[PDB]
Design an enzyme around this catalytic site. Structure first.
Site, PDB file in Angstrom:
ATOM      1  N   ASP A  42       0.815  -1.200   0.000  1.00 48.69           N
ATOM      2  CA  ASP A  42       0.000   0.000   0.000  1.00 48.69           C
ATOM      3  C   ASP A  42       0.856   1.260   0.000  1.00 48.69           C
ATOM      4  O   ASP A  42       0.722   2.089  -0.898  1.00 48.69           O
ATOM      5  CB  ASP A  42      -1.018  -0.010   1.150  1.00 48.69           C
ATOM      6  CG  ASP A  42      -1.974  -1.196   1.103  1.00 48.69           C
ATOM      7  OD1 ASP A  42      -1.737  -2.133   0.269  1.00 48.69           O
ATOM      8  OD2 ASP A  42      -2.943  -1.197   1.908  1.00 48.69           O
ATOM      9  N   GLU A  91      -1.795  -9.804  10.735  1.00 55.85           N
ATOM     10  CA  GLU A  91      -1.573  -9.282   9.400  1.00 55.85           C
ATOM     11  C   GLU A  91      -0.086  -9.001   9.198  1.00 55.85           C
ATOM     12  O   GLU A  91       0.437  -9.137   8.116  1.00 55.85           O
ATOM     13  CB  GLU A  91      -2.526  -8.091   9.221  1.00 55.85           C
ATOM     14  CG  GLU A  91      -2.234  -7.195   8.038  1.00 55.85           C
ATOM     15  CD  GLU A  91      -3.262  -6.093   7.765  1.00 55.85           C
ATOM     16  OE1 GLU A  91      -4.218  -5.877   8.598  1.00 55.85           O
ATOM     17  OE2 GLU A  91      -3.146  -5.472   6.688  1.00 55.85           O
TER      18      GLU A  91
HETATM   19  O1  LIG Z   1      -9.861   2.032   4.723  1.00 57.78           O
HETATM   20  N1  LIG Z   1     -10.938   1.761   3.830  1.00 57.78           N
HETATM   21  O2  LIG Z   1     -11.142   2.644   2.766  1.00 57.78           O
HETATM   22  C1  LIG Z   1     -11.797   0.589   4.012  1.00 57.78           C
HETATM   23  C2  LIG Z   1     -12.571   0.546   5.183  1.00 57.78           C
HETATM   24  C3  LIG Z   1     -13.421  -0.543   5.443  1.00 57.78           C
HETATM   25  N2  LIG Z   1     -14.219  -0.510   6.692  1.00 57.78           N
HETATM   26  N3  LIG Z   1     -13.790   0.038   7.853  1.00 57.78           N
HETATM   27  C4  LIG Z   1     -14.779  -0.088   8.775  1.00 57.78           C
HETATM   28  C5  LIG Z   1     -15.896  -0.748   8.097  1.00 57.78           C
HETATM   29  N4  LIG Z   1     -15.477  -0.965   6.818  1.00 57.78           N
HETATM   30  C6  LIG Z   1     -13.503  -1.608   4.493  1.00 57.78           C
HETATM   31  C7  LIG Z   1     -12.728  -1.564   3.303  1.00 57.78           C
HETATM   32  C8  LIG Z   1     -11.863  -0.474   3.044  1.00 57.78           C
HETATM   33  N5  LIG Z   1     -11.102  -0.485   1.800  1.00 57.78           N
HETATM   34  C9  LIG Z   1      -9.975   0.441   1.393  1.00 57.78           C
HETATM   35  C10 LIG Z   1      -8.578  -0.237   1.469  1.00 57.78           C
HETATM   36  C11 LIG Z   1      -7.722   0.146   2.787  1.00 57.78           C
HETATM   37  C12 LIG Z   1      -7.061  -1.017   3.561  1.00 57.78           C
HETATM   38  C13 LIG Z   1      -6.059  -1.708   2.551  1.00 57.78           C
HETATM   39  C14 LIG Z   1      -5.141  -2.722   3.239  1.00 57.78           C
HETATM   40  N6  LIG Z   1      -4.550  -3.671   2.242  1.00 57.78           N
HETATM   41  C15 LIG Z   1      -3.859  -4.720   3.000  1.00 57.78           C
HETATM   42  C16 LIG Z   1      -4.798  -5.973   3.170  1.00 57.78           C
HETATM   43  C17 LIG Z   1      -5.167  -6.476   1.747  1.00 57.78           C
HETATM   44  O3  LIG Z   1      -5.664  -5.462   1.006  1.00 57.78           O
HETATM   45  C18 LIG Z   1      -6.178  -7.608   1.872  1.00 57.78           C
HETATM   46  O4  LIG Z   1      -5.368  -8.658   2.559  1.00 57.78           O
HETATM   47  C19 LIG Z   1      -3.903  -6.898   0.898  1.00 57.78           C
HETATM   48  O5  LIG Z   1      -4.285  -7.327  -0.348  1.00 57.78           O
HETATM   49  C20 LIG Z   1      -2.948  -5.705   0.778  1.00 57.78           C
HETATM   50  O6  LIG Z   1      -1.763  -6.103   0.184  1.00 57.78           O
HETATM   51  C21 LIG Z   1      -2.600  -5.191   2.200  1.00 57.78           C
HETATM   52  O7  LIG Z   1      -1.686  -4.196   2.029  1.00 57.78           O
END
Ligand SMILES: O=[N+]([O-])c1cc(-n2nccn2)ccc1NCCCCCCN[C@H]1C[C@](O)(CO)[C@@H](O)[C@H](O)[C@H]1O
Ligand SMILES: *[C@@H]1O[C@H](CO)[C@@H](O)[C@H](O)[C@H]1NC(C)=O
Length: 765
Positions: free
Chosen positions: A538, A735
């Protein structure tokens, strides 16, 4: 024969506890069909049940832990839930009984044991909730003899095209059922099992919690209307016990109240099979499934020194069962932006602002329906399909059951659009969408994600070169079958390959850039000033500011991985034209990694940009990115560059911590800065690739044999022990891990690529 195995596989895998987003539920791999779900919660007051009731998975202070102790999707398994808030240790045993034409039968046992701290006389509400979607299907509760509910078992009889005839029984069960001496009992019964049968429009059946509560509230309103009041109130549990109203419908709520310990059974009997399923059947199959799980574990995940001991075996079974136990079936529409706005081409300086403006147009629309059968990173936080994650999840799974892995790969590739795009996150259906804020549901056809499913395909090819038991390996045991599988998939692999080179291409020709090939250069689309979500890493630091001339060494290495597998599969199918095209691309990536990405000054690979004065600049941040050519298996065992990378991997003041390799070097200016996600913590997925490559160099003649052997030995040790120490202390896979303290941090229940630890322990790559 391929077709025949295909059908047997289909019938084997049809039923499962394939709703990993909830504590316990079943669905078959059919989009619109029969689904079940379990809810429970203590009732101490008039107002507490709404806060205590459990259904979707979470992780907070009120829940100690939960997960599968044993699991195989073909046979079933056992789950343990440790609920502090509700004072309950719960066991859910699920078992599949093959037979008939419709995917077979299954049964489950639900057992609740109050913990030491619970009142011995705790009242606990348990609900089994059953829905059925489909235009022509039927489901009916046989009414009880008794006026007010059931003294014995609850039987639901149903039919659908997909399932034929079936019966689903919820048994009487063992445990004290509390009795009320209230007036109310003349109208509602003293206390017994009750069923309500209802109907809602198909698309809202998944909303089990609100549907249940809408019934509880109507029950309470009925009390108020009929002059039951605070002058003389019925006990809480009786206020929250539904009035019995069985019948036909697409929703059935089966409710029981228990005092103290309870257990009860769910028996799904496919009519097209032999005799129906009994409780005695369930006990036997449960015992049998354990035995088989035991034996397969000992063969497939035979842990090598120093992890031979029984403690690491329990650990191994837990990391493995939770990974394979996360497998879900999803179905529904996704939210995709199909505008292909020109701004998404990212050709201008400042492109990130252009792209934000296109996003602000909100042209995305629902499309589908799609289905997906995949494992997931996390039951409570990420219970859905992630593209590059799934590459890691399948490595242990493929060891266990290669046919299962191939099913999941097939399932992913069936999503691919005509252009070769698979969305990096699969949010399928309103149910899946409920757990994700609207602003992050939208998928973008220009967003890649590492093609790690190719690593699984590599393992399968090498295996192919060199009844439930039989099916698990049919695709390697019958070479004919493996090749046909590869025949059908090969076009899609190639479409993806072409798609990368079409949509993720970097710019050599229009800059003062010298290099061996003019073709081979890549840049991840989708980067913001602070992020590059598409790379998987990320917030790993990238050139500032982002720029159409950027090149990304991780992305180029992933293209390398792809060409290598296409070479191997192409050969197997004899696609000679193809194989020679690939050969020259591989050759060109090998040279171009050096020409564009190698820093002589810094001793590692780097991303590149173009300067203020329009010349190519290397931008080095020592960390995972820097080792990419090595991680992905692209370097020759005698390579001097490799020896320089081994130096970097081994160097404690850079990457090497007691706990595993740091994501970013302690020397980098960006160490532990901003959100610090990929800017210092230890990640098992990348550690796994390093370990696997160190072992490769360690078990071949060459100059680095002995350095690699030392590093391999130590790094395997540190990674397993860090993950084991945390599992022991906390009960969870995490994680990522803190390189200063060794503590697990961020998300729990991450199984999740953290389970790769089972493979690292068992060795012999
Ligand atoms: O923060 N939000 O925008 C958000 C908030 C909620 N939420 N919060 C409360 C209720 N709902 C749900 C989804 C999102 N999505 C945006 C994405 C940011 C987090 C990305 C992290 N990615 C790691 C895990 C992973 O993505 C999967 O293992 C791996 O692939 C990657 O490699 C890793 O780096
Ligand atoms: C399993 O079988 C059904 C009926 O033959 C079929 O429609 C379904 O698509 C199969 N599932 C897959 C794609 O694995």
């Amino acid at each position: 024969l391929h077709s025949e195995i295909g059908r047997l596989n289909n019938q084997s895998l049809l039923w499962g506890p394939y709703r990993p987003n909830i504590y316990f539920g079943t669905r078959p791999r059919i989009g619109k069909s029969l689904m079940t779900g379990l809810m429970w919660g203590k009732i101490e007051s008039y107002t507490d049940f709404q806060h205590t009731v459990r259904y979707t998975c979470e992780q907070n202070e009120g829940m100690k832990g939960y997960g599968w102790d044993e699991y195989d999707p073909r046979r079933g398994g056992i789950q343990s839930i440790h609920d502090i808030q509700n004072g309950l240790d719960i066991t859910t045993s699920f078992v599949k009984i093959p037979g008939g034409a419709h995917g077979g039968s299954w049964a489950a046992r639900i057992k609740g044991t109050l913990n030491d701290d619970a009142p011995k006389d705790q009242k606990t509400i348990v609900v089994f909730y059953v829905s059925q979607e489909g235009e022509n299907s039927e489901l009916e509760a046989v009414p009880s003899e008794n006026e007010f509910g059931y003294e014995g078992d609850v039987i639901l009889k149903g039919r659908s095209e997909a399932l034929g005839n079936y019966k689903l029984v919820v048994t009487k069960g063992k445990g004290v059922i509390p009795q009320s001496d209230h007036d109310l009992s003349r109208l509602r019964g003293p206390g017994q099992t009750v069923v309500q049968s209802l109907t809602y429009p198909d698309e809202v059946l998944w909303q089990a919690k609100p549907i249940l509560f809408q019934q509880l509230k109507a029950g309470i309103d009925w009390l108020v209307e009929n002059k039951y009041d605070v002058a003389d109130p019925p006990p809480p549990w009786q206020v929250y016990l539904l009035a019995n109203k069985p019948g036909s419908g697409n929703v059935h709520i089966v409710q029981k109240v228990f005092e103290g310990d309870f257990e009860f059974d769910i028996l799904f009997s496919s009519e097209s099979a032999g005799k129906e399923v009994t409780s005695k059947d369930l006990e036997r199959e449960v015992k049998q499934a354990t035995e088989v799980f035991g034996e397969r574990f000992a063969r497939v995940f035979d842990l090598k020194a120093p992890f031979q001991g029984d403690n690491y075996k329990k650990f191994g079974k837990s990391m493995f069962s939770n990974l394979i136990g996360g497998i879900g079936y999803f179905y529904g529409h996704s939210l995709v932006d199909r505008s292909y706005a020109p701004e998404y081409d990212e050709e201008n300086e400042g492109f990130w602002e252009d792209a934000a403006e296109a996003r602000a147009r909100h042209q995305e629309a629902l499309e589908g329906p799609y289905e997906l059968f995949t494992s997931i990173p996390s039951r409570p936080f990420f219970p859905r399909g992630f593209l590059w994650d799934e590459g890691f999840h399948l490595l242990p799974i493929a060891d266990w059951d290669i046919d299962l892995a191939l099913e999941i790969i097939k399932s992913w590739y069936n999503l691919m659009d005509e252009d070769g795009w698979i969305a990096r996150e699969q949010i399928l259906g309103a149910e899946a969408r409920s757990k994700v804020p609207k602003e992050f549901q939208t998928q973008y056809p220009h967003y890649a994600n590492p093609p790690t499913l190719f690593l699984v395909l590599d393992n399968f090819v090498e295996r192919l070169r060199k009844l439930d038991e039989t099916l698990s390996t049919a695709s390697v045991d019958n070479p004919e079958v493996g090749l046909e599988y590869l025949r059908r998939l090969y076009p899609l692999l190639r479409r993806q390959f072409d798609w990368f080179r079409k949509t993720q291409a970097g710019d050599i020709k229009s800059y003062d850039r010298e290099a061996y090939s003019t073709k081979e250069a890549y840049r991840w689309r989708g980067r913001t000033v602070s992020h590059c979500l598409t790379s998987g890493l990320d917030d790993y630091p990238r050139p500032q500011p982002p720029h159409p001339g950027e090149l990304h060494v991780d992305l180029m290495s992933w293209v390398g991985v792809m060409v290598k597998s296409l070479i191997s599969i192409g050969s197997l199918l004899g696609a000679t034209e193809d194989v020679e095209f690939y050969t020259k691309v591989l050759d060109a990536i090998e040279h171009n990694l050096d020409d564009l990405h190698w820093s002589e000054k810094e001793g590692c690979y780097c991303d590149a940009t173009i300067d203020e004065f329009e010349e190519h600049k290397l931008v080095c941040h020592k960390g995972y990115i820097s080792l990419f050519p090595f991680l992905t298996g692209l370097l020759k065992p005698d390579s001097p560059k490799l020896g320089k990378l081994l130096a970097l991997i081994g160097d404690e003041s850079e990457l090497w911590s007691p706990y595993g390799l740091r994501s970013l070097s302690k020397k980098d200016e960006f160490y532990g800065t901003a959100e610090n996600y990929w800017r210092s913590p230890v990640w098992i997925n990348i550690n796994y690739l390093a370990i696997v490559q160190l072992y490769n160099i360690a078990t071949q003649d060459g100059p680095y044999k002995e350095t690699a052997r030392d590093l391999y030995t130590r790094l395997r040790k540190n990674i397993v022990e860090t993950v084991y120490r945390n599992w022991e202390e906390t009960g969870f896979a995490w994680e990522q891990y803190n390189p200063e303290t060794g503590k697990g941090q961020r998300t729990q229940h991450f199984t999740g690529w953290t389970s790769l630890v089972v493979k690292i322990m068992s060795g012999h790559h």
